[PDB]
Each structure stands twice: as C-alpha cells, then as structure tokens.
Amino acid sequence: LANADIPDLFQGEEYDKLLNNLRNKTRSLGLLLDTEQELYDWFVGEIAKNLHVVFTICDPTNNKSSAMISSPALFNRCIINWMGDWDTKTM
Amino acid sequence: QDGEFFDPIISRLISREFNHAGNRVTVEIGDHEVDVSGDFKLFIHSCDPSGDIPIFLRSRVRLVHFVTNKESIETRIFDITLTEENAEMQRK
Amino acid sequence: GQFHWFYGISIGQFLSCFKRVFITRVDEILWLLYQEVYCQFSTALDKKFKMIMAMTMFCLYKFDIESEQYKEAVLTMIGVLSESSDGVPKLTVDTNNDLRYLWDYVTTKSYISALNWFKNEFFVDEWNIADVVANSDNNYFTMASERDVDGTFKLIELAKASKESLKIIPLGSIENLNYAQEEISKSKIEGGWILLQNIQMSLSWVKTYLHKHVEETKAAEEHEKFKMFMTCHLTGDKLPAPLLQRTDRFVYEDIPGILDTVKDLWGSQFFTGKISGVWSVYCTFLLSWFHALITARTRLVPHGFSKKYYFNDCDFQFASVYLENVLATNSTNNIPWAQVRDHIATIVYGGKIDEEKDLEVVAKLCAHVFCGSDNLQIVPGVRIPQPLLQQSEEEERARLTAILSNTIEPADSLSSWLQLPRESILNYERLQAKEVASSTEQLLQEM
C-alpha cells in the first residue's frame, strides 16, 4: 500500500525476468519506453490501479488487529469504514 | 481433540459452505476440493478454558461448557442437605 | 492450591467433608460446616496456611453473623497486625467481649498469640496425624514437610501404638526402587504398613511405575488392611497433580526444641560402639549442642541467618569425622582447639554458606561452643566441664547424659540460648504475623 509493489518479490534474477516480461507486454499494448525507470513506473502504476485490498477486521480491540489500524501505510491508503454493531432497526 | 489450536482450513467446514453438484457436494479445503458425505459429523473438543479460540470459530461454533465449576458446588450441596434434612420430599 | 502445588482440593473432597457434617437449625449446620472444614483441610496445610485459613474462615462466618460494628472493629485489628493501617477499634461497654480480649493480645505486642486466637475460636479438635490417618479411608498418603525435619520417626511411633507393621523403604538407586516395587506388591497382600522415604528424588520413576501402579490398584481397597505412606519435601520437586489428588495429604509441622534435639543427637551416639578416647565423647557432646544450636538458628530468618540454610545429619557426620581425626592425629592435650573451629566453621558447615554476613555467625558459634577451658556454659543454665581425671568413658557418657536431664528449656530460649537478642525475635514474630494478616485480607477482597 505505501508503494504499489513489494520490492522483495521481484529482485535479482527474478527482477530481470520481470523486467523482460514487462518489455513484452508494454510493447504488445503499443508503447515502448526509452529508460529502465520509464518501465518500472508502468509496472507499479498498473498494480496501483488493478489491485484492490479490502481488510475485514472484527475486533479492532484485539492487539493484532490494532496493529492493522496502527500501521501507517494501511491507515493512510485505506478507507476506514465502521459496521461494528447491528442496530435495533436492522435487527 | 485440541480445539484451542485450530487452523484456518477447516474454516469452510465450520461455516456451512459448499459447492453443490448433480449428486456430489464439494468443500474447499486449503487447495483440494473434497466431497462431503452427509453421514459425516464434526465435534471440536478443548480441555483448557484458559486457551482462547479465534473469533471466526467462536461465532460459528456452539460453545458448550462441560465444566465442574465452583458454581456446581452450590447446586450439589443442596441435594446432599435435602437428603439429610427432608428425606421424604427428596425421595418424591 | 494456586500458591502451592501440594495444597490441592477436589470438589469431591469438600462434598465428602460436608456429608460428615450430619452423620437456627440452618445457623447450627452452618457452624457445623466451618468446623468440619477446619477439621479436615487444616491437616494438609503448613502452620502459616493453618493460621491464614483460621483468620479467613473466622471472618467468613462472623461478617454474615455478627454486627456491622463488629466487622470494622476486627478488620481494623487485622489491619494493625498487617502494615495496612493502625487504629483503635470502636469501644463499647460490654458490647463485645471476645473481640475486646483479642485487641488486648495485639496491643500487648504479642503476635503469635493473636494469630492463634482465631484457631481457638473455632472450638475444633485440631486433628493429630494419627486421628486423621485413622479416620481416613484410603490406603495411600503423602506427607510433605520442610527439609529441617522428617516425619519418618513420627510414623514409627504411629505404627507402634496401633497395628504395628512398619516397613521403611528408601528409594535410592536401581536396587532400592527395584526392591521397593517388590515390597510394595507383597505388603498389600500381607497388609503391612509401608513407607516410601523421599520419593521426590526418585520421581522420574513415579510417573512411570507408581503413577500407573497406584491408579490400577482399586483392588487395594479389596486387599488386606494396608496403608502406604510417602514422604515429600514442600520446597522441592513438584509431584504429579493427578497422583497427588488421589492420595491423602498431611504436613508434618512439628519442630523440636533446642534441648530436645541435643538429646536426640546424643541419643544415637551410643550405638556406634567404642573406638575412640573418653575425651572424644566430650567433643561429640560439644558437637551435639553445636548442631542443635545452628539448626535452631536456621528457621529464624531473616533475623538470625540471612537465608534459609539446611544442615544435615551429614553435616554432623562430616564434623564428627574431623573430630575423631584431630584427636587421632594429636595428643590428648586440650589445646588442639584452634583448627578444630576453623575447619568446622568454614569447610564442614561454612561450605554451603555463600554470604559473608552468615559466615561470621557460624564462626562466632564455634568461638563459644569449642574453645572453652574448665567451664563452657553452652547455655545460661547449663555448664559443661571438661573430662575428669578419673577418665571413665562409661561414667562420662552417663555424666553428659545427666547434664541434659538436669536442664529444662526456658521460655525465652530462642533469645537466651541462641545468643541473638530478644528484640530480634519479636521483630520476627511481627513479620510472620504480617504475612498471615496480609494473605487473609487479600483473600476476603478477592471473593
């Protein structure tokens, strides 16, 4: 969420394989990108617009679920929404 | 036998989730889709009340306490008292 | 049971106790309960927890039964015994007399008396291990105790006075456990009593052989009148709870006086025969007093010794061995005395001591017990003179036994005999009061 990639997943050789596959799809769509930087920023931007994370936390009181809301990355880039109880009408 | 510890995968078997077919009824467990009988029954058993179970389970699960508490003493001393106090009415 | 492993209770133990309560009516039966519970469960607790359960159960009854003015008066007293608060309770002519008698104990700075007050107020016969055993309807018993003492010798006189059949079984090596399991299966058929000395050490075996063996033996009820006893140590390896709950429990809390222990040390010494000088028996007598004086100091802590130290019959043995050796290697001239003290005070007994504070105390005891020309005066009343010229070894045994039989241990023994001050003893009495008073208040508020 802070970035829109997990750096670790694609590093070293697996970075080069991603980088190769990236050039293939980019051209297939019809755009060639001058620099190595021009490429990665397509990749990240694609993730940012196609991947959507919804968290479902039940007791925010729990110390492990507190850490979710705490986490800055999640707090800033998530839309916090509250459904904590059923009201008498909805019951 | 150990309800305190509980992995996620049983999960779809706890919530009643299934994918129904012409004759076969399938449930997803971790990876493999396996067929459910219907003669099949499930019970989860725990030994220590100290051990805390996941909120997922606790909500889908019927929690029943087979515990011989200190509260059980009040109930059981009356039965012993009445047998030695009014044996005619405890008999009847 | 939460504080200590040996202090377990099942619900069934309370039920079986409440059944015995039968075989203002509601008020009398209530008073019958408190008494019967004090009677059965006082036995499986040590002196501290006896006093704790006394004061607690007293307030458990009287807070419901007596006045609200009673409640704060006794509680403002239990607050004075503890360090919670100090006050004078609300005073009314003839209003309360038992309660007025209690505060008199607390105000007189007399602590042990005020703690035992709640025990007397139960109006119960505090059951002697014999009575408990006799009433008890099981073939198994575990009696734990502090390492200072062992109820092994209480069990000898318990068996002698009724039903005989005493069999002491040490659990030592493979041989002892192996002989042990043989003597166990045969004694139940025979119906003889059996004792299993210091199981805690041989425990790994318990969980495998004894844990299964005692569990399987429901035919032990079917078998001839037989009773198995096991000795534990409270400070020590934790017994399996399931085996513990199945078996009846007692705490041997019986502490001998200084003089009594001297007499008990000296008592066996004649069984060894005769191998040494007449003079030696005097040194063996000296050690008898010495050992009984440090053991007496061991319990009194912190005032007294810095930590609880445990001294053994092994410590006496290693000391007497050194004494035989010094008299064997030197002349009969008295002056060898210098290095007798050093070796007793620093290797034999000062060995386990680690704190410098306490090492000086063992030395200062040796200063008084060992060096001494013509007259020693171990205690205020008793003087030990050095061997007579007649040099009769049989006379001197009898003379030194006679000196024990002449003396009777004073009221103030812990301060007069152990040369430590009276004000220290009171400080200690105050603290064990505070510990009982605290733990009771804690218990009341928790429920």
Added chain:
Amino acid sequence: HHDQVSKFMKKMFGSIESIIFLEDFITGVRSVEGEVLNLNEKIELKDSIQAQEWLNILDTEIKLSVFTQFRDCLGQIKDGTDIEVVVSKYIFQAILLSAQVMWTELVEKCLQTNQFSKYWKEVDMKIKGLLDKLNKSSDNVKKKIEALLVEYLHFNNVIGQLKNCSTKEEARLLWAKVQKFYQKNDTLDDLNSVFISQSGYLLQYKFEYIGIPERLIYTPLLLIGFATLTDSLHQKYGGCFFGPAGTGKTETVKAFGQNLGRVVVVFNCDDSFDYQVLSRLLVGITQIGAWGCFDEFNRLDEKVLSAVSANIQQIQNGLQVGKSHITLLEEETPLSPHTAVFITLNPGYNGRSELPENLKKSFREFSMKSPQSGTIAEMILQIMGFEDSKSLASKIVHFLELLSSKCSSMNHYHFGLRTLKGVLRNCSPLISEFGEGEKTVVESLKRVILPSLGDTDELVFKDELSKIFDSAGTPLNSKAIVQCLKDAGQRSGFSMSEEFLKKCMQFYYMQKTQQALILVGKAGCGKTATWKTVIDAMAIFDGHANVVYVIDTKVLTKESLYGSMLKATLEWRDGLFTSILRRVNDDITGTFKNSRIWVVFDSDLDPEYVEAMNSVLDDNKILTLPNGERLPIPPNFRILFETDNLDHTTPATITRCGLLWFSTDVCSISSKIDHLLNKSYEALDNKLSMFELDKLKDLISDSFDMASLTNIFTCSNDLVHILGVRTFNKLETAVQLAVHLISSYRQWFQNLDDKSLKDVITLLIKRSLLYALAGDSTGESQRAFIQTINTYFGHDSQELSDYSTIVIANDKLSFSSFCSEIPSVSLEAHEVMRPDIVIPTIDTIKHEKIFYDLLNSKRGIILCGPPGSGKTMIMNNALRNSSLYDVVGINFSKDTTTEHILSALHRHTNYVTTSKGLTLLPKSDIKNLVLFCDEINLPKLDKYGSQNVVLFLRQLMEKQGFWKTPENKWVTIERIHIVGACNPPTDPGRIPMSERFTRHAAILYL
C-alpha cells in the same frame, strides 16, 4: 603401522600428544605442552603384537618413569643442588613434586627450631635465581620455569606467613591448612610412596603424567577449595562447587588433580554433547579409577540430566559402600575406589543452581567466591621484578578499592581485579621505560584507569592517587609526540585544545599496550578526529605508514563481515573483516611489514558481533572461523571501536580492550567553525579562482565574530526543537550554508558598494544561522528567534524579517532587497488530483527556496513534520522543476533492508570502474541524483536497538562510500544526495533516530 596410534593417545591420556619410537622400541612420549618424557625401559615391539597389550605396558611404565625422574631429582636437591641445575634435566611434573617434598620437609623442621628467616632468604634467592634464568631461556623450558615459579612463590609466601605468627600454635594452625607433600621413607610399592596431607587428611599421589600445565596462582581461597575437595574425598563423597561463572571452579578441580598427579577428565556438559558418549566415558573412569569433573553440570536437558544424575549416584553409592562391582548402563562393570566425580554448578537466571535430589546425599556442595585480589596482586608484582611487592599490592588494591567507593557509580566502571591484572599487565612494558618501582605502577594506573574516567571522577582519581602514593614530577615522551600531534592537526584543520590534546595523548599511549581500542562519546565528540589525528602523527614520528579500514559494524551481517557458511553445500566465502586480514597474513605481497594496519568499527557494537571475534580480544591474537580455520593477527594490525554508547556490551569485552571515554567534546564552538570554514574553502578552490577565493574568505572573517554568536547559540537551547539535535552538531549546517550563500553572489561582489556588500553578507549569515538553529523549530519560535538573532548581532546591520530576501535582475546586474513574490496558478478540472500538483503559497516558496539552498551545500536534509504538511511535495516540486537534480523515491516500512535502498538506486545508477576511485557509483545520467527516503523513522531496530538502514545512510552521508555486501569491496558514491521526510517521533509508530546520523542533516520542521 603403530605410529598412527599416537593421534588417538591425546584423547585417551589427556596430558600426552604423540608417542616416540625407535620403531622396534618406544623411547618415550611427548605431552600436549611440548615436554618430552623418556621411559626407563624402552618397550619392545613386534608386528604381531596387540595395541591393547603394548599400550597397557606404556601406561604402567609412564607412571614408573615419573617416579624414577622424581626420586632421582628429589635426591639431588637433598644433596644441596641449585634448582637452576635440576630444571634443565628433569621433566616438570617430577621437579615440582621434588620441590614440594623437600620444601615440606625443610619447613616441618623449621617449625620446631623457628629458623624461618634463614630458610626464607634461602627460598627468596632461589626465586630471584629462577627469574633471571627465565629471561635468557629457550621457549620450551620457559614454560617449565614459569610453572615452577608459581610454586616457589607459594613456598616463600607460606614461610613468610609462618615467620609472622604470634606463637607456635598459630604456626601449627596455618601449616595444617596447607597442602603438605609427604613421602614414606619406610616402604615398597613406590607408586604408592608419595602421599599428601591437608587439614589432617591424607591422599595418595597417583603417579600419572600431567605434563607442564598452566599452573594457577596459589590463593588462600584456592587452598580452601583444595581443603573442601580433600574433606569430601576422605569420606568417599563427590566434590561439588557451585558459584558464578569466571570463579575457576573447574580449573580448581583440574589443579587439585595435578597436585596429586592426576589428569582430570572434564565433561563440558550440554555443548551439544551426546549421552551415549558420556555413558561410555563414565564406565572408563570407574574402571581406570580417574577423576571426572562435570563442567557446568547445570546446563543439561531434563531427559539427559535425569539419566546422567542417576548413573552418577551409582558411582558415588558404589564408592561410599565400596562395592567391588556396580551396575550402570545395565551391565556389571567393576569399580576402582580411586574414582571420583566432581560437579561445578554455574548459576541460572533464577539463582545459584542445585544438585538433583539423589546427588544431595552423595556430594558436598561448596561456594566459590572471587579471590580477594590483594594476594594475586602481590605475586604478580613478585614475578615481574618486585621492588617492594607487598607494599604495592596493598597500595594498588586500596587505591582501586578506594576509587570504587569514591567515584560515581557509572556503568562501564570496573574496579574489580580484572582491572588490576590489566594495570599490572600494562605495567611490564612500562617497567622497561622506568623502574620496577611504584612510579611505574602509578603511571600504569593513569594509563588504564584514567582514559575511562569522566570529569567528576577524574579528580577523585588524582586526589586519591596522590593520597595513597606519590611517585614523580616529570613524564617521558612529553615533547616528542606532542609536536608530532600539533603538526598533524594544523594540517588536518583541527585546534589543539586542553581536551583534544588530552584525549590524543590518552589514545597514543594506549595503542602501544592495547591492540583493541574502544572510543566512547556523544555524536560529534571528536573521536574520528582524535584517532585520525594520532594515527597521522605516528607516521611523522615513527616513519611507519598506516592502512586504515573504516567499517560500519552493524550495516553488514555477522555473515557479511566475519564469514558466512551455507548449511548444505558448506561453501565457504570470505566476508569483510576476514578478507582484509588475508591481505596482511596470507599474501603480504606489497609492504605490510613496515605499515600499521587499523581496522575501525564506526557503528554501534553488540555482543553477537564481538563474541564472533572474542578470540582476537583474548591473549590468543588469532581469529577463529565458524568452519575451517584460525587466522593469527600481527602486532601491526589494531582494531578500533568508535561508538556513542556501551549499554549492550559485557564488562568482559571492555576489560580485554582499552577504553577511552570522551566526557565532553574535544573542541570549542569557535574552533569548530574555524576548521569548518577552512574545510569549506578547500572545496571551493577546485571550482573558484584564487582572487575570488581570497576576497570571499576575507568577507566571512569580518562579518561574523564569535562574541555575538555566543549568545545566539545559548538562546538556541531556550527553544523547543522538533527532532532534537545538539547545538554543536548543528554548526556544520550554518557554515556550509553561509559559505555557499556568499559564493552564490560572488560575481556581484566585484562591482558592488563596500558598505552595501557587508549588508548582503550579514543578511545571508543571519539567514543561514537561523535555519541551522531554529529550522527545526515551530516557526512561531522561528519568528521569535529571528528577533533574538537581530538583538545579538550589530544593531545597525541588516535586520532579519520572516520572509526577508535578496533579489537581482532578470536582464541586468542589479541590487535590491524585496520579499515574497508569487507566480499565479490556473489548472484545469482534470489536473485537480495529481501526485505532482502544487498551489504555491508565501510559505511554499519560503521552504522550497531554503530546501534547495541546503542541497547546493550538499548537506543532507530531514524534513520533519505532521502528515499532510507538504514535506514530500516541497521536496519533490523544487526538484521536479530543475535540470540539475533528479529524485528517486524510497518508502521505508517497519522492517525495510539496506538492499532495498541499493536495488532502488541500481535502477537510476551506473557503476564505473575508473582507476581514480576504483569502483564508483555515480548516477546513470550525467547530472545530480537525490534519494528521497520517506518515513525514515519507521524501520525498526535490532533487539539491542540499532536500525541498520539509518546507519547505512549515515555511511553514505559521512563516508561517501560503502562496502559491497557480497563482492566485498569499497565503492565510492559520486554526486548522490540523501534527503528524508519523517514524522515527529512523538507520533505513534515512530522510532527514535541516532544522533550520529541526524548530525549530518539539516532539519526543517514544516
């Protein structure tokens, strides 16, 4: 082969290493120590002979051969032969026993006559005689003399004590406590002829070879331990001493054995040790009748411990009863009654450990205590060349003891004996310079104890040192080093202050003695300056070059640094710390012999990393590999540690190394500035004409005087600072800015009015001074401080306004002062949300200008501020606009690695292998690059508490180059900038940053 058995003997004997043949005949054996024992009868061999048969004869003959060498020797000394004569021809084990027996005999008679003095000098002379023999001796016999010295000192000590006794009873008491070595002049079975008396109890010397082991100094405490061991054994009980680690409990049991001619088998328990092996060894010990010591018995696993403890009972119960055969490991094995079991019990976290219950009536527990040091001190002084060893030992200890009671309780202060052994160790080279006098001791006290003390305690040392003993007026090496130190600093830029000279002197004198050096101080104390100055001064004074390797300790892993092994292929690759040593050791191809090698660790030091090097810190001076090797370190190769705190490190680690505590900063505020200015001017010389430079340096000197600034820096403290950094470390921020702002307007200084010029200077300096003290302030405070600057600066001089600016023309050189001018923004609907959109404010321009100015200085920037305060945008938009700099965005998370930083850089950076810097890492394009590290106070810290990712940036900011993690080489980064944003660390989630990193940053709280 036969000869191939010698390998395995080391195991089954313990004392010997390899066996000597004439092939057909066994001439003798040699010990693990190097000592050669020759047998009486050389044992004959034929091809069809069994090992069991021939070796069994050797065990017998090896003991006999020791008796022979003992009686031969004892008889010689009895016939008035000087001990110097005997040493050269007899094995140590023999000569030791001979001394003991004669000593004992000679003192036994001397108790009767009271002729102590006549025997004392006599002994004292043999001691001196042995000492001078040692200096001129072959390394092998050097061991033997030293080993004997331990004993002869014991002899004389006991006699002296005996001389002193009030009466004869007093003397017979003291003598009883001692270990007295008797021989039976009565009898046959010679192996059984020697026996030992102590506390009345006797104990037969078995004749086993011991070789020449490191013999423990005799202490009263040692004898008492010996006395408890003899008291337990006499009654057929097991010896057991509990107590804290480092009290030498197993060493005692080793020594107690030796004294009685026994090689004790020590079981180090729970060093991943098998039960099956121990069970075998226990049968062997009960058969062979040996002594086994359980070294740290407490550390066993419960299943093992039960099993072992039960076995041990068999042995000790077998002995107490005396059973001929006992059953253990479910087989009938015979039991020697010479057998004994010893248990050492290290304490847990819970308490001093206990024996299992069964062992409690089978053993005798004793409490080991650290030796009262006085006795150790006296002997150590005796060995070196005494003068008055008794007075020094009393005096040194009193003083050390006195310091302890009189100094402040400070964490790293150790006035324990370890410390006096160290004073004494340092003393030996010192004696060479001066005397075996107190004066040499006095100097060694201040050479060790003083560099680690802090100002309050620094006088307590001086007051009580002179209070206890006064030695001398004047110091050697006083002029010569000092002029070599002044000359090095003038060249480096530094000012020789009270303190900078002092801590430079303290350091110089320590490298001499110590090979591991520690420098502890606040961030910006002067450490790097002290050592870099001293090391530089030594190449002037000695003529020896230095080769420095500065490594950030905690940036790299233990595997990256010491040597990392891969679990399956077991493939061994070098590391960093080990690989730079192989240049010196393995292949000194160039000049290393005449060079001085220094490996500096600039980062925080922790147990795990120092433990993996503890062997170099030991008296060993060798490096032990995880797998494969030990590499020895030369006397040139010194390891330094510069760090800010110690909390993690062990007192054991400190006392192996030399510690240099920097109580306060070496240098004056002014003096810092002075150096800083000149350091800044040198950068400009490479890009500015001398005429320009000469004029601009003149300007700076006359515009700002120290008297004004002193109040300004004082008032800086009376102010609330977000992301707090101390005044002294903020200084580089002023001067670097100030000089750049003036070198900015250099061209307009050619033709402008001299009164007006000063106003341009003063304004810039008043500005640069503001952000450097109050830049991290509220700005509500900035405004307040602006007036404080104006107040303390000259009243007439151009005053500072909140938005005050200096302006020059678009098309013509001009000069006027106008502030707060804004371009006006119109944007379309679609433009509204965009990761790069700024609606410029009076304050956006204000921050963007200063932010850009700092980068021109090239000082790192920390933009600290609340979320959504615009710290990211101000940074981004000022640079997304300019052609010069190019931004690279890294977000940090609670657990981000230093490789993520590298990988993100690799995308925009190109390494070039130019011979100028070797490897370099400039940006992949020609113009300057900016790393933006967002959420810099987010990555978490080692359990010790040290965030490596931050230290890595600190490496880049300060060193300007980093070490390659896999390939192991130095790459110097060219033209790359570090900028960071963080939240206030009062906010949740946030981690406190090391002053050692934030010192290189300009902090702007927005």
